[PDB]
């Protein structure tokens, strides 16, 4: 379900891995929109940022 099967060319597929160490050195795997969104939700903006903690 994640990579497929058979003797077919390894075309890239968007991975839905959580943000972390698996995100370095990929060079041919694109992220998923959920994966990007989850990390971006936890970042401060340049303008009108409401810092907490």
């Amino acid at each position: 379900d994640l990579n497929g099967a058979g003797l077919v060319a390894s075309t890239p597929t968007p991975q839905n891995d959580a943000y972390g160490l698996v995100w370095a050195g990929d060079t041919f795997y694109p992220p998923t929109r959920k994966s990007v969104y989850d990390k971006i939700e936890t970042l401060a903006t340049k303008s009108g940022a409401v810092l907490t903690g």
Binding site: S47, G48, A49, V50, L51, T52, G53
Partner: protein, 53 residues
């Protein structure tokens, strides 16, 4: 207009200071114009021949 939760007036660490915190801290100090000193204020005893303000 970036904002952050105001730290306590006793905070003396690397936490970001807010304008409300600054006002709260300065509320305990005397201004140049018409200060009302309370308690036991002390000043330097000048010479008897001193002739200024």
């Amino acid at each position: 207009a970036t904002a952050n939760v105001s730290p306590s007036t006793a905070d003396n660490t690397l936490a970001l200071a807010t304008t409300a915190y600054v006002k709260a801290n300065l509320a305990d100090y005397a201004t140049l114009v018409s200060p009302i000193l309370t308690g036991d204020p002390r000043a330097v005893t000048t010479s008897v021949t001193d002739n200024d303000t």
